[PDB]
Design a protein around this nucleic acid. Structure first.
Lengths: 125, 197, 260
RNA sequence: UUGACCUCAAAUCAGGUAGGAAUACCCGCUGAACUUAAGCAUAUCAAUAAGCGGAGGAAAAGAAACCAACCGGGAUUGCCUUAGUAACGGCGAGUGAAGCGGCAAAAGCUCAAAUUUGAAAUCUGGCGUCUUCGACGUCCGAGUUGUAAUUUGAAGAAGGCAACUUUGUAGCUGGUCCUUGUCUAUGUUCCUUGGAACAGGACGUCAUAGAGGGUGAGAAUCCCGUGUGGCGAGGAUCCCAGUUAUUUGUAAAGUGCUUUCGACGAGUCGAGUUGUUUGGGAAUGCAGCUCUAAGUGGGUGGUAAAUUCCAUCUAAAGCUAAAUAUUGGCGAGAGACCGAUAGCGAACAAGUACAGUGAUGGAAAGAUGAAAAGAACUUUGAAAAGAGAGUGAAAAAGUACGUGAAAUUGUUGAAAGGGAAGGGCAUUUGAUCAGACAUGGGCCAGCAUCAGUUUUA
RNA sequence: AGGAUUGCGACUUUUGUCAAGGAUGCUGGCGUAAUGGUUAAAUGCCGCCCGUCUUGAAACACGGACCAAGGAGUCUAACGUCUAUGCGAGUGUUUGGGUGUAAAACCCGUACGCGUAAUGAAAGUGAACGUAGGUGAGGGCCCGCAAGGGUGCAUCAUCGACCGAUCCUGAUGUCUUCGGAUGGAUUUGAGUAAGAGCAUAGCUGUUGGGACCCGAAAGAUGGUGAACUAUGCCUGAAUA
RNA sequence: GAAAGACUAAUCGAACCAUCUAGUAGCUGGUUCCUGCCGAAGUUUCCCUCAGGAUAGCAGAAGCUCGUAUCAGUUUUAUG
RNA sequence: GAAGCCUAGGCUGUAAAGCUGGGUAGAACGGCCUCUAGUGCAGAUCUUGGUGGUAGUAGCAAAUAUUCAAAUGAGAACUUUGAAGACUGAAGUGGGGAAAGGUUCCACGUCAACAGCAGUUGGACGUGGGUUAGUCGAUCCUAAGAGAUGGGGAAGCUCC
RNA sequence: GAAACCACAGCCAAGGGAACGGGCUUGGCAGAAUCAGCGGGGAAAGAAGACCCUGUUGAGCUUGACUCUAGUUUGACAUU
RNA sequence: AAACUUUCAACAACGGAUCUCUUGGUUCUCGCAUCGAUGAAGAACGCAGCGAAUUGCGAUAUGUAUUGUGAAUUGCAGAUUUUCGUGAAUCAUCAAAUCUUUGAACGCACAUUGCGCCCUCUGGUAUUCCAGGGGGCAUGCCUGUUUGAGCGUCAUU
């Protein structure tokens, strides 16, 4: 620490996390890019969104990969498809994973997702 | 209530003293506020000093008449003696005091030297165009200090004349006690009764 | 706070009704009306001798007494017995009163500073301040005191040409100017002898700050303190030659058991 | 008969303005007692709480009718000293300032009382036009029972003589000061433990970044940040810098000499008397009532008078930043502080549920797991539930949920019990338990000769 | 008991020996639940229920059905004796300024407090006849083979000297009423006589504060109630 | 108040609600861990003093100057 | 496998206490040198919370009174229908209102708690439905009273 | 399906003792578990005695106790 | 001999201490000055697809417009396709509007959703009666404007 406008305090740090607004949770729930994609765009991480394509690198689910269904900002999570529990009655339920573990593989693009890469200082689309 | 062999104290704590207590926790933090205030003022003003130039003055009473001290303002007689008006002097960084008087030739000279030393060393920029800046000196007291006048001759002659300093004080003190009645005793006997003769 | 226990309005029932006396809450219709208050033994009562702001926090100390202790701490920097007893892996180092060249003063980055400590005779002392790092036992865990770790070496210097910026991010290393230099850094935990790393200009300046016989001081009306005894070695004096040659012989240390 | 002036009215006349809220701090009025004196009445608590009126980010105070007796200081405010001192007090208990000295911060000024009298020179509103926090022109009104210019005691004015050194009003860009948005390093390589590496071991990388937080267990290197520095946007604008229009001027200011004058606040000052207050003592200030001035005059000089001198200021009208305060409000930092009977009354739908006619009074209540994966299906039962099964690392985690102590209860096992049990010293029996005979294949006694202390023939 | 030897002795022709400054020698059984340890019951003797006020409690004196957590000499402003630390006729940085890795650490100095002089109500005056004086005791050192002599700090007793107040005395001089020389006195001081204090910290004790914890009958300020009940007024109703 | 010190929201020889207020008490009750060493007093004088304080006495702690001293809750001879 | 908790296991210290085996449980905590305090409980008719003996005991007795079958339901001394006995006896256990309550009225579902026995019933619980005015009331007038304005008090809250 | 109460409990005589023991001392004695009654004991429960004295603690009422006071009345000065 | 009574241990009850945790408190420091007749603080009654409370808002009612970010919200529904966009959202932001009935509270009253008066447009045949839509009517004080009152008083017929 050096500047006087930052609080090295455990109570204030956790309060900012748990009671964050919906827009601010977009920046927190991020995920790193793969070693293949890191050579293309030259960016280490981005905010994770709805229609993606992702690989689980840690935990019990690691090895599998699938498509992202919805970014659950309320619970700090991201529901990925094909990562489910089949209950005793024969009903599928999605399992939640924190996106810091998850790794992005084939980025979804719009106008602003291209311009986001240009802003950070990255080549290509 | 009392009784061993202790000194009789005087503690004035029978009012609601706890409601009106102050603890100076701010001492350390309040120092930085003043250093910040002195710095930020110099940035606004820029090439001028923070202090006004003050004169040399002698102190009152028997206890402090043997020492000199920085006064308030330069008087109207001394400002005239150097060669300038009182209204002009206020904008050059020279303090003026309309109520202080002069009854001493020694203090009169000292402060005329102080003004001539000030006027020579300072520079003045015109209102119109060019302004060749020359940094800022903050304290006027640093460049123009106060020195104690020397009335000393270290080695000196020993001129005795059998007068006795102790005997001089006893005679001089006796005159102050008795001049009242000695005037009135002379106003009788020699005057009034004998002026009638 | 104040006004903590005083907020409720309550007075005692007194004698007649078989309970204690001691102030009880007025008669509403809750599960509270009837309960006690105010007294230190009561639930939601007053604290006995409640803490106030105007207690004595800081302590005044004499100016000469600080400079006596600070001077003795700089004597403790040398002498290898006190340094090893007060932690510090100083087995490798060639001698102590360790001085380094003034090229150290113009270091820029950490990569330069870390390589310097290896070549001089340290880094094992910095590695100690790395394995060390563990959690607290008390309640500093949730009061912004979440980890401990031990102290490293000190780097003393005269002039600044980027020395503080380089050694800032090193785990255990602290820095200090010679002109300042207090008791806290030299003898932390009230134990003498920290492993100091002096520079050439810093080491040469010490005669100009404190003083010697012919050299003055610079501090206003200060000279170094003289000791009661000249030389600490008493065993040399008792044996010596002049003292021992005078007196009668010993009585074989330990005596017999008599009248058994 | 008609038109003015002076006082007083009316209107849903044109246009404005005042109330309540909050109250930590600030300016006044009003005003207690418990208590202390070992009783109690003056005193003390206290010029304090409650009650009433009025302000602002600060308020109040402030340019001497001052402090002094020195070789004199020089508006106010605060801090350190003065000092627990000089004085006050059933001289008991107790109370109690200020001058000088060292610092923080320093800034000074405006009316009335004179004739513009060769030109009410001044100002509100109406109507019109412009570059609209305003400016220009025009028409009624205000006002000579006094609105401008000119002067304020430090002076100053009216004349004469004499040299002249100075000047001014808009917007545009940039910096500066605020509110902000975005960008800027380095491993998720191998092996053991596990439900899960954020653990342990081996090998690296970045560091002006090893603060803090998040993620299935102690993460600089997984994520947000942190550090270092860039790059925008939107306000404030005179504080500075640099420019461009202008266009002020024969008008405004300053200074040397000499002559004549030199306006200064009234039911006030001051005196007596009553009540109150102060450290202020033949009376410190304030208020009511009666008496009531002056022109070298009046005030003060901490003992009442009369008499004579000296030193000091100029009252009875007014404005003003800074250093100083702040348990309230809006926004940021920290802690050798508490850790759910603590800390605010309140970590939860708390001034909530509930009580009183009413003023008011006023609680309890935090924690399944990493993830509800919150127990499908069989079988007994009218059902609640039970036995199985199934989920999970664990159901000795089942939403009467982390850990689950004691009082207190049920079952099984062992022991004893003729008006209570429960203890201490010493054995016996029953139960149960530590402790160096392992290398090649200590525990318990008996007799003999001695030493120390005794006893008995 | 003790744990190399040392001493006093005895018996010895001698070497040596010994009951002489605290036990060695020889033998057997078992080597583990046998000896010991805790725990429960039985038997012998002994044992009233704690806490408290009191001359005196098992008490027919008071509090205590049982368990868990909470629960009572604290902090401050002036201080006294003793103790440690630093400097020492001085001592005290921290109101304030300078700096800074920022409530820290480090540096700076005018003042000012206490101390270095007292005594008087005040006006005021203001501490060496002599080696800073004698007498009695005094540790230590010096001279001596000793007996004894010399030198004697601290301190204790004791008679003197000096400064202030008090009461007399009253010289040369002199604004003729000021001035106070010198000499004295059963008086008198929290005085002088080769200076000791100042600052920080600690236990104990003191006084004000809520003042180790709980406990009154009261007093004062400002507010809310006549739906019960007391009484009058206005308007209605009820009584074989 | 046709009078009992009656009634005045279960409250009356002076209602209830908050605040000053942690009102004051010479009077009652309580006052939290071990071993080790020393070890009292209820008496004298004064007090709107007699259930309470001051003052001496008894007790502990810290010690200082010295090292067989001119001492003893005692006896004897002489003498009041 | 840290803390905590349980243990007729063991070892040390005169003691305050400490160390350690077995079980339970699932995230932090110790020794030695110093600093510092809201630092040790059996008592206070102590404070708050929980649980005993007493005890399956005291008791659930005033308003004259119940009985027989049938139905529904797992279950009927107590619910619904029938039959028989009874009482209040029109100053009433009848029919309507005032104050006061506020959905308790009414239908369909349904019994974990409440109705000091029980419960299929309920003023309970869950989900809905329901109050229609020119003429009935309020509104309008005045009563004992209350209360602005013009005025005069009071430092003022406000008083007459 | 409760409450009061409860140190621990519940057999007597005499002794001594804080002068009238259910527990100490000396004798008498002494047999599981229990149900109706009853009022001899438990100095049985109820309430920090109201009678009495003490406190340098209060309040209600009375009066030629001590010191005050609203109201009223007399005089002076102002309104004049 | 059992039951019963008392002490201990294992398992099971009762109850929520102990231990570890913490989006809350408490103290200290630093910065800034902003309520209201243009209708405040407070109060009532309403509003969500399914809400009782809390959190937001006022018949434009868990909000509308304006700007920024760039795809959600999520207990269950349901869309809208807006998803290379003049755009998802209980997001952030906030400078234009709406703002029921009240309250200093203002036409007179107010244990009443009581009772009036003026201007203006539209209906029923209407300057006068009935209803509907819109705009207005408090008190003290100041500056001016227009009507006035008094032998208070001046000049002119």
């Amino acid at each position: 620490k050096q500047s006087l406008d930052v609080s090295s305090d455990r109570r204030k740090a956790r309060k900012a996390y748990f009671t964050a607004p919906s827009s601010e949770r977009r920046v927190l729930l991020s995920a790193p890019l793969s070693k293949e994609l890191r050579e293309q765009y030259n960016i280490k991480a981005l905010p994770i969104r709805k229609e993606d394509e992702v690989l689980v690198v840690r935990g019990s689910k690691k090895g599998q990969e699938g498509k992202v269904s919805s970014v659950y900002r309320l619970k700090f999570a991201v529901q990925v498809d094909k990562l489910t529990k089949e209950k005793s009655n024969g009903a599928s339920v999605p399992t939640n994973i924190h996106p810091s573990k998850v790794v992005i593989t084939k980025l979804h693009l719009d106008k602003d997702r291209k311009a986001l890469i240009q802003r950070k200082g990255g080549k290509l689309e | 209530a009392i009784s061993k062999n202790l000194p009789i104290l005087k503690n004035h704590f029978r009012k609601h003293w706890q409601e009106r207590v102050k603890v100076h926790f701010d001492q350390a933090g309040k120092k930085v506020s003043r250093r910040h205030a002195r710095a930020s003022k110099a940035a606004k003003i820029a090439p001028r000093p923070l202090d006004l130039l003050r004169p040399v003055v002698r102190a009152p009473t028997v206890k402090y008449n043997r020492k000199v001290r920085a006064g308030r303002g330069f008087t109207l007689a001394e400002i005239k003696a150097a060669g300038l008006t009182p209204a002009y002097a206020r904008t050059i960084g020279i303090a003026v005091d309309h109520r202080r008087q002069n009854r001493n030739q020694e203090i009169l000279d000292l402060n005329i030297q102080r003004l001539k030393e000030y006027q020579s060393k300072i520079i003045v920029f015109p209102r119109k165009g060019k302004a060749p800046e020359a940094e800022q000196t903050l304290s006027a007291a640093a460049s123009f200090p106060i020195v104690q006048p020397v009335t000393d001759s270290e080695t000196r002659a020993v001129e005795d004349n059998g007068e006795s300093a102790y005997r001089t004080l006893r005679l001089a003190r006796s005159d102050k006690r008795y001049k009242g009645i000695r005037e009135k005793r002379a106003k009788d006997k020699a005057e009034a009764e004998a002026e009638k003769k | 706070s104040e006004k903590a226990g005083h907020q409720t309005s309550a007075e005692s029932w007194g004698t007649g009704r078989a309970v204690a006396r001691i102030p009880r809450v007025g008669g509403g219709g809750t599960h509270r009306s009837g309960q006690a208050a105010f007294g230190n033994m009561c639930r939601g009562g007053r604290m006995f001798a409640p803490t106030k702001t105007w207690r004595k926090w800081n302590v005044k100390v004499n100016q000469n007494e600080k400079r006596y202790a600070t001077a003795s701490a700089i004597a403790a920097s040398a002498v290898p017995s006190l340094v090893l007893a007060r932690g510090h892996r100083v087995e490798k180092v060639p001698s102590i009163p360790l001085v380094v060249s003034d090229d150290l003063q113009s270091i820029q980055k950490t990569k330069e500073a870390v390589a310097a400590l290896k070549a001089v005779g340290a880094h094992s002392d910095v590695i100690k301040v790395v394995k060390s790092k563990k959690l607290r036992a008390g309640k500093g865990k949730y009061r912004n005191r979440r980890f401990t770790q031990r102290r490293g070496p000190l780097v003393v210097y005269s002039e600044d040409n980027g020395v503080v910026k380089a050694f800032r991010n090193v785990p255990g290393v602290e820095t200090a100017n010679v002109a300042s230099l207090g008791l806290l850094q030299l003898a932390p935990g009230a134990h003498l002898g920290r492993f100091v790393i002096w520079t050439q200009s810093a080491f040469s300046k010490l005669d100009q700050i404190w003083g010697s016989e012919t050299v003055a001081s610079v501090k206003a009306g200060y000279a170094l303190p003289s000791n009661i005894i000249s030389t600490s070695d008493v065993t040399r004096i008792i044996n010596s030659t002049e003292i021992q040659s005078v007196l009668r012989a010993a009585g074989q240390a330990t005596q017999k058991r008599t009248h058994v």
